[PDB]
Amino acid sequence: IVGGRRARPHAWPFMVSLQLRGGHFCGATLIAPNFVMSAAHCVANVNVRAVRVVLGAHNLSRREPTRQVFAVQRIFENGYDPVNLLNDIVILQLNGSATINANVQVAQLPAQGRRLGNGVQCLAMGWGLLGRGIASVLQELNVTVVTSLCRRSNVCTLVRGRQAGVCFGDSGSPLVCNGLIHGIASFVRGGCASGLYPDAFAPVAQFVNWIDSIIQ
Ligand SMILES: *[C@@H]1O[C@H](CO[C@@H]2O[C@@H](C)[C@@H](O)[C@@H](O)[C@@H]2O)[C@@H](O[C@@H]2O[C@H](CO)[C@@H](O)[C@H](O)[C@H]2NC(C)=O)[C@H](O)[C@H]1NC(C)=O
Numbered sequence: 067i068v069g070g071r072r073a074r075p076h077a078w079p080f081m082v083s084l085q086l087r088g089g090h091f092c093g094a095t096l097i098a099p100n101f102v103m104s105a106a107h108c109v110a111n112v113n114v115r116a117v118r119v120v121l122g123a124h125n126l127s128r129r130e131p132t133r134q135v136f137a138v139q140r141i142f143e144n145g146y147d148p149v150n151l152l153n154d155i156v157i158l159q160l161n162g163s164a165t166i167n168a169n170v171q172v173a174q175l176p177a178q179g180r181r182l183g184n185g186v187q188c189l190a191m192g193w194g195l196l197g198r199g200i201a202s203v204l205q206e207l208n209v210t211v212v213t214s215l216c217r218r219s220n221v222c223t224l225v226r227g228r229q230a231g232v233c234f235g236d237s238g239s240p241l242v243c244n245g246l247i248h249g250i251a252s253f254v255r256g257g258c259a260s261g262l263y264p265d266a267f268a269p270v271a272q273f274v275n276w277i278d279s280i281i282q
């Protein structure tokens with residue numbers, strides 16, 4: 067997150083760090099005790115048997131007894147199309163179920179097909195690059211939905227009046243709009259925080275019936 071701020075500790079208890087050897091590489095969202103959802107590009111080319119799913123985290127640099135760590139049992143995809151940057155969504159089934167508490171909560175999803183109008187206010191968040199290197203403390207950022215310089219196959223967002231946006235390592239992190247997870251961070255254009263191209267998220271609302279079929 068470039069140009070954002072520290073989140074309050076455990077403000078977003080559905081927020082997940084995907085890690086290897088350990089080190090954060092992608093965000094994810096807890097959508098049921100035994101499922102997280104993330105971007106398909108986060109795990110294409112990764113050995114998922116090595117991925118650790120870290121719930122309840124805030125400051126990645128510290129020991130945190132609030133954390134719960136799972137492994138990935140299986141992956142559900144939905145036509146991931148990297149060439150056209152489409153269907154950037156995966157559901158990872160965990161090897162066990164999270165204990166739901168103050169620091170670990172299931173996210174709330176929108177209605178199937180629900181669109182967001184130009185001007186909708188959301189928060190992006192994640193432990194991605196700050197502009198520097200990876201964040202230790204979870205970061206958040208106020209962003210605004212734009213439909214211009216964005217396909218109907220994405221939710222796009224832009225910060226106006228300064229350069230700020232998601233960046234590497236924020237991939238797969240939720241975009242929360244009106245208390246609901248409406249995006250998963252997917253791609254940027256013009257480099258991070260260009261101040262020109264909107265950031266692009268997988269449109270979770272298009273995938274809700276598919277998500278519901280998997281998690282129950
Ligand atoms: C910056 O964002 C904050 C928080 O965004 C809201 O809550 C998120 C979880 C998500 O649901 C977004 O779509 C929401 O916009 C905004 O904080 C709200 O601020 C209003 C003032 O109008 C206040 O009444 C609410 O209680 C705040 N909500 C929360 C949950 O903190 C804030 O307004 C945004 N600031 C700007 C300038 O856009």
Ligand SMILES: COC(=O)/N=c1/nc2n([nH]1)[C@H](c1ccc(C#N)cc1)C(C#N)=C(C)N2c1cccc(C(F)(F)F)c1
Pocket residue numbers: 105107108147148149150151152153154232233234235236237238251252253254255258265266
């Ligand atoms: C047309 O412009 C364009 O292709 N931009 C890209 N940006 C990509 N990619 N491509 C790559 C990519 C490749 C395919 C898809 C899809 N669907 C999404 C992203 C990539 C990988 N791996 C990352 C991390 N990212 C990337 C960089 C910075 C932030 C993000 C985030 F997901 F956070 F938005 C993602």
Ligand SMILES: *[C@@H]1O[C@H](CO[C@@H]2O[C@@H](C)[C@@H](O)[C@@H](O)[C@@H]2O)[C@@H](O)[C@H](O)[C@H]1NC(C)=O
Pocket residue numbers: 115116117118135136137138161162
């Ligand atoms: C679920 O997995 C937890 C963490 O697994 C660890 O990370 C994975 C990627 C492998 O490296 C694995 O060998 C590590 O243990 C376990 O701690 C936990 O016991 C598991 N829970 C179950 C099986 O219910």
